[PDB]
């Protein structure tokens, strides 16, 4: 067939109960992951295919660069809460690797009031507990899919796209492919 499992995507042998429908995992440190977003635009190209009633969840993982790997889960969570991940995540992206000035939170925080976000609005985010709770729901996504890399991407928590298994050769053919497959995926 043209879709095979194994192929572009793979089956999760233990399916996620309630999971998003369409969940990507990514880190700011990892530069697949600014590839992915800033030059491929994997999770825009994704969007536009998807079925109506089909949202697009993005989450960010710890375990790559430490303290401020966890310092950018949080500040991710305060994204989600505030609703200004459109406003942040080429800043973050960015900061982390172009420019490398995100060295600390408060760099990461400067990021946010730079685009708009007041300091005593990012700070009570930043402190709440809707926060740690949607911190602790990324750490627990990551577990449930048994997450063993960026970037990545799961559908109704049955299935995981293989990029590997896609063609690389043109960029945008691989845009395509992956997006693609995300849609047959979602109608699966």
Same mark, same amino acid.
């Given at each position: 067939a043209q879709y095979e499992d194994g192929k572009q995507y793979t089956t999760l042998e233990k399916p996620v109960a309630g999971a998003p429908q369409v969940l990507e995992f990514f880190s700011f440190f990892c530069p697949h992951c600014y590839q992915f977003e800033e030059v491929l635009h994997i999770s825009d190209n994704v969007k536009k295919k998807l079925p109506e009633g089909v949202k697009m969840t993005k989450y960010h993982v710890n375990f790559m660069g430490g303290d401020l790997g966890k310092d950018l889960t949080q500040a991710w969570a305060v994204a989600m809460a505030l609703g200004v991940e459109d406003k942040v995540?080429?800043? %973050? @992206?960015?900061?982390?690797?172009?420019?490398? #000035?995100? *060295?600390? /939170?408060?760099?990461? *925080?400067?990021?946010?009031?730079?685009?708009?976000?007041? +300091?005593?609005?990012?700070? /009570? /985010?930043?402190?709440? @507990?809707?926060?740690?709770?949607?911190? &602790?729901?990324?750490?627990?996504? &990551? &577990?449930?899919?048994? %997450? *063993? +890399?960026?970037?990545?991407?799961?559908?109704?928590?049955? !299935?995981?796209?293989?990029?590997?298994?896609? =063609? #690389?050769?043109?960029? =945008?053919? @691989?845009?395509?492919? !992956?997006?693609? #497959?995300?849609? !047959? %995926?979602?109608?699966k």
């Open positions: 995540t080429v800043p %973050l @992206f960015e900061g982390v690797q172009k420019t490398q #000035t995100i *060295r600390s /939170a408060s760099d990461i *925080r400067d990021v946010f009031i730079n685009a708009g976000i007041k +300091g005593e609005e990012y700070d /009570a /985010a930043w402190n709440s @507990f809707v926060v740690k709770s949607l911190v &602790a729901q990324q750490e627990k996504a &990551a &577990a449930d899919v048994q %997450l *063993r +890399g960026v970037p990545a991407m799961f559908v109704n928590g049955k !299935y995981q796209l293989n990029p590997q298994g896609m =063609d #690389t050769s043109n960029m =945008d053919v @691989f845009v395509q492919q !992956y997006a693609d #497959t995300v849609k !047959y %995926l979602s109608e």
